[PDB]
């Protein structure tokens, strides 16, 4: 029975983890044989050493009985370490945490506010939804009291029981009424977090809570005009935590209301001027202000000043504020789509930043910055950026180019030009989900498949290791070989479409192990398609099917058998079912 800090020094005197695990299991067996004696005196430090093992990640699953026993103790420190072990070793899926219900319930009825503080603490940190339905009648009872040490814990415990049971929030509506003049700002902070949560959950609660807008307008005006407080105060603001929470409750309320949005008009006009962009905190205040402005249905004159704020936030050399300004313009995409578009050179300039996050947010901001006019010039630098990307940006950029091109394509020719340029420059980095999207849009095209599939064959002759490229290309060849090989049933004057390497490129994909076997599924599907699309060179692909009948894949063996039966027995049924596939949406 050594001390906790003795085990700390024991593990810190270990260099090798192959020896540190030996030093773990020594004292672990000491704790295990100690728990066989049912000792309630050293149980504090035994469970503490066991939690020190769990913190570095050692087997501590067995010592949860004794955590429950420390919660089932009567001394204060034993209960303290027991609730620590309950928050650390127990969770929702532990399956043994349901025994805490009676103990937390009696410790919610404990005389001390600190033991009730721990009973609210563990229930707010990890109280399961089944435990929420068993304790929320006593959670509100500690909200029916007025102890300012306990009300701040009961309000966020109510946030937790809404978080785990969102159909139990109706019993805290009568418990949250008109406690919104509490002078303790901690209780007031937890109450504004609770109102933000309640307004986030149900629209039926909005109408009860958009009535108390001017009350919290007065509270926020009292906190903004508060020049100094001894506590609550970092960088000269009396509780900016509660200021951001009140501005966030102002952001989610009045977002589709006009009366409450003009009830909060003047305090937003004040805090847009009574902030300070010097340290981090006032920039946070002003950014939450501009978020509140851009999310409510505010006056556009507020939005003039707010876009002036965000143009200043782009100018700040702090990468914090550059991330904030990119997130800012990423938030006000649809709201004020015009005044964000004149930040375009700065948004493109943020693509050359030395951060993964700033390049990511500027990339997505240029993606959301696309309209029906900037599609020409921006996509050139966007694909230049994709060519100058990193392999982690290539999936997101390859998706975003496709998504902003499917909406705002000025020309279906140039649309497929940009798509084919991306399919060359990305290759095996685009997601396979975008491949049926590209297939669906090029079959939504009807007038250009010559220009599509000729350029397809011009590109894919050099490469097949780009896997989604040939995922596109095999279906493209199988559906539009008749437009690829045009009027060439026999040998003519030499045109580059040759109907023998057209089959051999797919066959070379087949023989090569650079093939995900849905490459091979698409390719054999294209082979069976081009027996009717081509009358030029037939009965050579039937050879490929007949020799392919003993391949090692399951479905490809099924596919070769089900083809070879048609190619040898039901040739009259092959051209009957090889019509083009119809267009869906």
């Amino acid at each position: 029975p050594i001390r906790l800090r003795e085990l700390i020094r024991t593990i810190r005197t270990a260099r090798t983890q192959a020896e540190e695990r030996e030093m773990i299991q020594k004292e672990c067996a000491a704790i295990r044989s100690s728990f066989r004696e049912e000792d309630n005196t050293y149980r504090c430090r035994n469970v503490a050493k066991l939690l020190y093992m769990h913190m570095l990640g050692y087997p501590a699953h067995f010592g949860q009985l004794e955590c429950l026993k420390l919660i089932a103790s009567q001394k204060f420190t034993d209960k303290r370490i027991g609730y620590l072990g309950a928050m650390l070793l127990l969770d929702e899926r532990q399956d043994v945490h349901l025994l805490m219900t009676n103990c937390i319930k009696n410790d919610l009825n404990h005389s001390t506010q600190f033991v009730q503080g721990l009973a609210l603490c563990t229930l707010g940190c990890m109280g399961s939804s089944e435990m929420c339905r068993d304790l929320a009648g006593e959670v509100e009872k500690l909200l029916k009291t007025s102890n300012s040490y306990l009300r701040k814990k009961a309000a966020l415990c109510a946030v937790h029981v809404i978080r785990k049971v969102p159909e139990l929030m109706e019993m805290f509506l009568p418990a949250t009424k008109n406690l919104l003049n509490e002078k303790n700002h901690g209780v007031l902070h937890t109450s504004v977090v609770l109102l933000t949560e309640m307004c986030e959950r149900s629209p039926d609660m909005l109408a009860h809570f958009r009535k108390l807008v001017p009350q919290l307008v007065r509270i926020l005006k009292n906190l903004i005009m508060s020049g100094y407080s001894p506590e609550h105060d970092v960088s000269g603001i009396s509780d900016p935590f509660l200021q951001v929470r009140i501005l966030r409750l102002l952001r989610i309320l009045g977002r589709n209301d006009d009366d409450s949005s003009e009830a909060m008009n003047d305090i937003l006009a004040q805090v847009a001027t009574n902030t300070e962009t010097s340290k981090n905190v006032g920039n946070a205040i002003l950014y939450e202000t501009v978020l509140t402005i851009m999310d409510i249905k505010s006056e556009s004159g507020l939005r003039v000043l707010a876009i002036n704020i965000l143009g200043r936030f782009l100018l700040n050399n702090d990468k914090n504020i550059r991330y904030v300004a990119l997130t800012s313009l990423l938030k006000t995409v649809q709201t004020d789509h015009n005044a964000v578009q004149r930040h375009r050179s700065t948004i493109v300039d943020c693509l050359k930043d030395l951060d993964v996050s700033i390049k990511r947010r500027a990339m997505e901001l240029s993606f959301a910055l696309v309209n029906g006019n900037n599609i020409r010039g921006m996509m050139k630098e966007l694909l230049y950026f994709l060519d100058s990307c990193e392999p982690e940006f290539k999936a997101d950029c390859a998706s975003g180019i496709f998504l902003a091109a499917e909406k705002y394509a000025p020309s279906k020719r140039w649309h497929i030009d940009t798509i084919m340029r991306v399919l060359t420059t990305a290759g095996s980095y685009v997601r396979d989900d975008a491949v049926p999207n590209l297939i669906q849009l090029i079959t939504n095209s009807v007038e250009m498949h010559a220009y599509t599939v000729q350029r397809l064959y011009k590109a894919i002759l050099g490469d097949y290791s780009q896997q989604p490229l040939v995922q596109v290309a095999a279906w493209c060849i199988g559906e539009y070989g008749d437009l690829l090989v045009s009027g060439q049933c026999e040998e003519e004057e030499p045109i580059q479409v040759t109907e023998d390497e057209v089959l051999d490129i797919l066959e070379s994909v087949l023989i090569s192990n650079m093939s995900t076997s849905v490459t091979r599924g698409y390719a054999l599907t294209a082979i069976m398609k081009l027996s009717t699309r081509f009358t030029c060179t037939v009965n050579r692909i039937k050879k490929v099917v007949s020799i392919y009948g003993s391949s090692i894949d399951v479905e490809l063996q099924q596919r070769a058998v089900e083809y070879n039966a048609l190619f040898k027995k039901y040739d009259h049924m092959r051209s009957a079912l090889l019509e083009r596939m119809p267009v869906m949406e």
């Binding site: 600190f114 603490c121 940190c125 946030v159 901690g186 970092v234 981090n280 990468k319 550059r322």
Partner: protein, 142 residues
């Protein structure tokens, strides 16, 4: 909503973990080792912001010991840095010139300052005096 709180050293040793979302221990080690690998492999002019798995992750270098959280990606981001700075001042006021060994030897007191400062992921006391006073009163109960 803060989903987790992580405190890992420069060498990668986990000094404090916290989970406000109940995900199992293998997932805990996976996510923890991933985040430790991400932050230790990033420079010093990278805004201390990472968009990692639907989370605008907020970390900060105060010393060799690195601190890590992640707010929900619909909230303000700089206030999470102010939360971590306020908790730094809490550890400095309760411990007194807070060393690494003060965090190493007396980790459970840092866990309890965290318990009396944040439950459920949200700030429960915005005063920098009432919280340390209450934990010194709970220590005064012992």
């Amino acid at each position: 909503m803060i989903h987790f709180i992580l405190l890992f050293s420069r060498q990668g040793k986990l000094r404090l973990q916290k989970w406000y979302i109940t995900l199992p221990d293998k997932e805990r080690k996976k996510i923890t080792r991933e985040i430790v690998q991400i932050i230790l492999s990033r420079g010093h002019r990278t805004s201390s912001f990472v968009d990692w798995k639907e989370l605008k992750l907020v970390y900060k270098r105060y010393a060799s010991l690195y601190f890590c959280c992640a707010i929900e990606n619909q909230d303000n981001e700089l206030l999470t840095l102010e939360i971590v700075h306020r908790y730094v001042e809490l550890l400095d006021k309760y411990f007194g010139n807070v060393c690494e060994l003060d965090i190493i030897f007396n980790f459970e007191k840092a866990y309890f300052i965290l318990d009396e400062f944040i439950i459920g992921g949200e700030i429960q006391e915005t005063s920098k005096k009432i919280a340390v006073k209450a934990i010194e009163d709970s220590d005064m109960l012992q």
